[PDB]
């Protein structure tokens, strides 16, 4: 085994921080803090972060560095029976890349829309607005920026549902094209160039959040937003759904077991201290979500106090924050064009490296499993991103938000919880915390503390089971803004998630069938790792 390496420890650290620090940090965590008790919510968030989140982060990073192989081969060597975990994680990342890059396309479309002297989401007079336009959010009316997003950027109103996708928006197809060009030319030559490009796509978000914070805190009414954001209401942490929300946010915010950390740590020097790296980058993604919460809510308090808009209306998660509420706040402050440009460039750079992560997980896993691809990386990556583009043209249609919202709901989440549960079982129970502690000792020089072993062994599977149970309990059929998705759309989304999950027991059974002996010998032969 002779493989390339990062060409610098800071390239690894910035790649992992870039992948981890997603838009979920900006548009999800602050909403949860506000909704789920303010600063009190950091007690659940911090507990679930410590017992279960960082353990699985450190676990996948140590596995990836030890095995020096991608997801498919790492999982096929640690527990051959569970080689299906590698295919599951790769296929999950493959589905995630169809929808996730649309958010970056929207970010670039707003960035390119921002160059006008007056920002087009400022006003209700424009042709795409209805008589129900009002300048800012109101009950039973649409804001000017909501009108702009739904009716000019998306044109979502001209589509009658997921079945009626309508015509391609070619400005959006061109923005998704530019997204995939930046991804291609960042991932074709491999970590040699990806590790350099993340010096921008992982450091610009902090270079923006700094000034976006200085601005937001110097706006009249920012302390009111900070109060709404962090006022402690400790009764809130006595509810189980608060803890489930904290754990789901932790798990998906870090992304432990998504296959990306294997693909990256695979390129570490074998004796690199992955323990410090796991701690450093887990802290940096939690603190980045926290600081982003101030960046957001300072401006949300500015809206609630100055623009005369109710706080319950603007404080929202997901696209309707960064593409509707926050631009509607930006358009009302001096040098609005500048804040618009940097804000949407920040969103694009929060997304870009997060998509590099998934794409690099797929490319490393397949190039490690198939040498034919390893020698032809530039051509495989061109075929891959051309596939992504031609599928993503569905998202670039008028009804494309319904395709985005469906894939976003079902692609990854149910399945990735199931995969990471089986990863925690395979490592901690079948392979062993003893063997894995020996492997970590041999790499970094000291065995993992008893805290980490008890976590990996007992807490992390119960942690993922708690998440999955409270994620299935709150299941409700998919709806988006008074549009109830047809039942066949939910069936298709369950086929997506199930196709991701079925790879685990399908490959398990195929392995069990293809190995000779009686059942005890088949299990033994498929349980012994590859070096033992």
């Amino acid at each position: 085994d002779e493989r390339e390496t990062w060409s610098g420890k800071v390239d690894f650290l910035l790649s992992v921080i870039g992948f981890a620090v997603d838009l979920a940090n900006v548009w999800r965590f602050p909403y949860l803090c506000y909704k789920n008790g303010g600063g009190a919510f950091l007690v659940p968030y911090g507990i679930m972060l410590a017992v279960g989140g960082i353990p699985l982060f450190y676990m996948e990073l140590a596995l990836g560095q030890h095995n020096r192989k991608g997801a498919i081969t790492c999982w096929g060597r640690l527990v051959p029976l569970f080689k299906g975990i590698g295919y599951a994680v790769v296929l999950i990342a493959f589905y995630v890349d169809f929808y996730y890059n649309v958010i970056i396309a929207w970010s670039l479309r707003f960035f390119f829309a921002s160059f006008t002297n007056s920002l087009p989401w400022t006003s209700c007079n424009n042709i795409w607005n209805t008589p129900n336009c009002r300048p800012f959010e109101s009950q039973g009316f649409q804001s000017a920026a909501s009108e702009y997003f739904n009716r000019y950027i998306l044109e979502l109103n001209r589509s009658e549902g997921i079945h009626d996708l309508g015509a391609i928006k070619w400005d959006m197809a061109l923005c998704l094209l530019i997204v995939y060009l930046i991804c291609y030319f960042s991932l074709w030559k491999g970590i040699s160039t990806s590790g350099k490009v993340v010096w921008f796509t992982a450091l610009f978000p902090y270079a923006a959040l700094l000034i976006l914070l200085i601005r937001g805190l110097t706006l009249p009414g920012s302390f009111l937003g900070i109060q709404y954001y962090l006022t402690p209401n400790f009764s809130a942490i006595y509810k189980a759904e608060v803890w489930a929300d904290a754990a789901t946010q932790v798990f998906f915010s870090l992304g432990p077991g998504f296959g990306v950390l294997l693909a990256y740590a695979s390129y570490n020097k074998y004796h690199n201290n992955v323990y410090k790296d796991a701690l450093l980058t887990s802290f940096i993604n939690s603190a980045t979500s926290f600081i982003a919460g101030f960046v957001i809510f300072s401006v949300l308090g500015y809206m609630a106090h100055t623009l005369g808009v109710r706080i319950e209306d603007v404080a929202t998660e997901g696209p309707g924050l960064v593409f509707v509420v926050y631009p509607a706040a930006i358009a009302t402050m001096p040098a609005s064009t500048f804040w618009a440009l940097i804000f949407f460039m920040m969103l694009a750079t929060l997304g870009l490296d997060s998509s590099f992560g998934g794409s690099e997980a797929i490319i490393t896993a397949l190039s490690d499993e198939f040498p034919k691809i390893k020698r032809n990386r530039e051509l495989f990556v061109a075929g891959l991103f051309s596939l992504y583009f031609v599928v993503g043209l569905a998202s670039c249609t008028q009804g494309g938000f319904y395709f985005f919202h469906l894939l976003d709901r079902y692609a990854a989440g149910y399945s990735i919880l199931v995969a990471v549960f089986f990863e925690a079982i395979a490592v901690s129970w079948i392979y062993g915390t003893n063997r894995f502690s020996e492997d970590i000792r041999d790499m970094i020089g000291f065995p993992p503390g008893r805290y980490w072993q008890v976590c990996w062994r007992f807490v992390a599977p119960i942690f993922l089971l708690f998440i999955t149970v409270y994620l299935l309990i709150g299941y409700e059929p998919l709806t988006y803004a008074d549009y109830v998705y047809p039942s066949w759309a939910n069936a298709l989304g369950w086929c997506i998630a199930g196709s991701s999950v079925v790879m685990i027991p399908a490959v398990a059974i195929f392995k069990l069938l293809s190995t000779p002996g009686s059942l005890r010998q088949r299990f033994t032969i498929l349980t012994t790792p590859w070096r033992d």
Partner: antibody
Amino acid sequence: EVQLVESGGGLVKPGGSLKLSCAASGFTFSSYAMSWVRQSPEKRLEWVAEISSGGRYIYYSDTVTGRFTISRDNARNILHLEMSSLRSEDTAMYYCARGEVRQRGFDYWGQGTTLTVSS
Amino acid sequence: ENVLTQSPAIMSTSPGEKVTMTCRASSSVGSSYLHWYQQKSGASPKLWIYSTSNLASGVPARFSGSGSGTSYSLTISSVEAEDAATYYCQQFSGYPLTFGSGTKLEMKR
């Protein structure tokens, strides 16, 4: 307290063979990587071999590799060094040294046992 | 292998003097992988200092460690009658785990 008691070791003809054995007690032997460390009659300490906590990572020095074989008996808390094709300059006192954490060195040492290789 | 040379090979120090002995590696050791052992005449070595600065368990507080890179040092502030031993530096950072020459501390009378 942790106690390590190296045993075996005696006169051996050059070209001969021997098995040193160290009985470890008072700690969870199964957890700790153990090293064998010899010391020539000149008090030059020389590290001989290492075995990891469960015997999956065996490291030898250039002077003894291919000839010696460190092994471990986590069921009995016994550590062994087989020595084969011994030669004159292998004559030394062989300590057993516990060394799990590389960053904390060899914390506990045994008494050592002398090997005389001579005709 | 990272050969570690210790100077001086022998040193006579009357009780009370402040003495320093230097372990010089051929190759850069990590500052948390160089250790010092005290072998009393007729007994197995004890871990004396680990990670270049940390007194091990039960080490009298007069000892100290310093240095980094390829030059490390063990220093004794107020040498006493108990310091008569041979002190060996060791690097644990890369196999082979080379011990150095050892510096013998002798009392003066």
